[PDB]
């Protein structure tokens, strides 16, 4: 029984489920009332659910250490009898991001500038632990060169999965041509490692009366522009978010061309997750980059 | 635009959102206070939103006609400018199902027995109209044989979608073998059509002070055992629910094997809805049935 396990693991006499079931695609979310305070619990039954949640915990702690963004405090990861795991975190009363969008834009810009301007400086792209893009674990092996890191551990990792799962000849051939072209989009620019949320789409951000809230991160040190790809692609972010952000971090030359590259990664990732519906966007984006 | 459209279609001067729900994975749900009374509104912007909501309306009315379960009254389906539709229904003050679990078990058993012992004469499996499992429309063409109906219009329909979107050969190979096994799983039993809620997972049931409440159905006449499958797999039902249910409808021979078969449909349905993470549960269940 989940409720009995939750009572034992959280050492609480009271456990009352409140609200409607969480609108999660990855996991099932339920909010519980506890003596210490309200909590939110995500349940995933896959075998490696603990690894995925531990990467999410590591991401939340890295974001919390900056003190620049409001994210739920992770509390406990519990191995579930019968496989899988549960992830307990602080419950946050949340509403859709609108009035606090401009505040979030400033916080995200500060987050991306945090590493280069701090006391101890991460001079490589990657992460100390594995984080998951959706259900797919990602290699975060440290790399000195961002185009190298993005091509190997993001684009190639996704395209290898596509070849294994779908053996799509068109993706194989287009990647062969586009792979050599990637350095052209980054020449003459200084790329600094920046701590990223990792999946900053509208579904992973919210607000309360104090301000904006972000959650469900898959963090790593990367190009700050990659973070915006999620945000622009799937909509849901007010214009003031991007306006406030780019006042502190203006669009570097070649922003729109790199945006195609970063949108490509998410199309491939959605192809591996959801199937042939994302084949045409993935291939079309590669063709536009080669045109 | 929605609030102004809602005021016009409901002919209410006042429309005050309470509870700040934002609830639902398939659709966006919000509770509004109106001159006539409080209402709950589900919004879906996909092209087939009207068909999906109309199947829900037909399902709610079929359950309400029995008088055996308390279900929200459907009110209006509104076509939205810009695509999609809104579904307005009676608002119900609801809390998570706990004390009323055993009561729901008796009501669900009575609901399933209504066709057999009531003035109901449906001697075939199916439904008079299309109902949707999530976003997926389902064929409910009447069939004399339940294993034929379930294999053709439920299992095969989902696997056809998986084949188109993922071209999963392992799913194809296991399904071809499971097709031969399906008639053996029914032990020569005569299956009686039973009116089903259709999606009785814990997130679709609740309670008030009067008793249990169920909602969001995708109804059809099928095997009564199929109803419990979703209820078991994703948890949330107290043990007293199943105890009260099976006091009125004991487990027929082969219950545990058919449960795997009915849980397979929900894993496939979650694969088509949420993606490849549900491939391993779907394939593992098929392998377990073939062992
Ligand atoms: N700490 C929290 N407190 C309250 N509600 C939360 C909390 N974390 C998440 N939620 C709710 O649960 C929903 C889903 O959360 P989350 O994005 O972490 O789930 P997921 O299934 O892991 O991911 P995804 O939905 O992005 O595929 C959020 O949109 C929000 O409504
Ligand atoms: N008639 C109602 N009155 C009040 N609240 C309701 C009503 N119907 C639904 N709700 C609330 O909205 C939540 C979601 O409702 P529902 O399950 O119908 O949404 P859906 O998005 O179509 O489906 P799902 O969440 O299963 O994917 C419920 O858990 C409940 O909290």
Residue numbers in the entry:
A (entry chain A), B (entry chain B): 0 to 290
From the paper:
Glycation, a non-enzymatic post-translational modification occurring on proteins, can be actively reversed via site-specific phosphorylation of the fructose-lysine moiety by FN3K kinase, to impact the cellular function of the target protein. Alternatively, the sugar moiety on glycated residues can be phosphorylated by a class of small-molecule kinases called fructosamine-3-kinases (FN3Ks), which are present in mammals, birds, and plants. Further characterization indicated that FN3K is responsible for protein deglycation by phosphorylating protein-associated fructosamines. Here, we determined a series of crystal structures of HsFN3K in the apo-state, and in complex with different nucleotide analogs together with a sugar substrate mimic to reveal the features important for its kinase activity and substrate recognition.
We mutated Asp217 to a serine residue to create extra space for the phosphate while maintaining the overall negative charge in the binding pocket. We obtained crystals of the HsFN3K∆_D217S variant in its apo form and performed soaking experiments using a mixture of an enzymatically prepared phosphorylated-DMF and ADP. Interestingly, in the nucleotide-binding site, a clear density for ATP (unused ATP from the mix containing phosphorylated-DMF) was observed in both protomers in the asymmetric unit with a flipped Trp219 binding its γ-phosphate. Furthermore, a serine would be too far to H-bond with the O3’ of the sugar moiety, explaining why DMF is absent in the substrate binding site in this structure. Notably, in the HsFN3K-D217S structure, the distance between the nitrogen of the flipped W219 side chain and ATP γ-phosphate increases by ~0.5 Å compared to the HsFN3K-ATP structure, due to the slight movement in the γ-phosphate positioning in the absence of the sugar moiety in the substrate binding site. This observation suggests that sugar binding also influences the nucleotide geometry in the binding site, and a true pre-steady state would not be attained in the absence of the substrate sugar in HsFN3K.
